[PDB]
């Protein structure tokens, strides 16, 4: 099918907010966590509270977040907490939204509250697939404000 975001127009809703998708999971997928979180942060804000776009945003953002807490500090306690908030806002995202198996992320995002190595080599599927860092995705993250 069309995941939830693309228009009959054979556009995305917000092409902004594909464009964090499309970065931050790229740098997600090739480790680089602290550059992902960027991207979904700086895009967070620009669609209010309270709806699908921002509660979504969110939930990336924190992701993103607790991946970082793992790989970079070792801090579980901060992965958890980031994941347990991040699955409050994922409820009522669609599974697919914006090309993101996010079904996907939530099952290992809750696995991961079990235990932590949930996440070990753990890629986020996009369109389908596993994308990875290209030099434009590290090169936008470093463009950011």
């Not at 740098?27 to 509270?49: A, K, V």
């Not at 190595?117 to 996009?126: E, K, M, T, V």
Request: net charge negative.
């Amino acid at each position: 099918g069309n995941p939830s975001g693309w228009r009959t127009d054979g556009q995305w809703e917000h092409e902004t907010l594909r464009r964090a998708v499309v970065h931050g999971v790229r740098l997600y997928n090739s480790g680089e966590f602290h550059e992902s979180h960027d991207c979904f942060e700086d895009e967070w804000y620009n669609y209010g509270r309270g709806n699908t776009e921002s509660k979504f945003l969110h939930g990336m953002v924190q992701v993103a977040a607790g991946a970082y807490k793992h790989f970079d500090f070792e801090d579980d306690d901060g992965m958890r907490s980031l994941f347990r908030t991040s699955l409050q806002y994922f409820r009522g995202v669609p599974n697919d939204y914006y090309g993101v198996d996010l079904l996907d992320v939530r099952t290992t995002v809750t696995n991961a509250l079990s235990d932590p190595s949930a996440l070990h080599g753990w890629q986020i599927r996009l369109d389908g697939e596993y994308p990875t860092c290209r030099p434009e995705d590290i090169e936008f993250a470093e463009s950011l404000e």
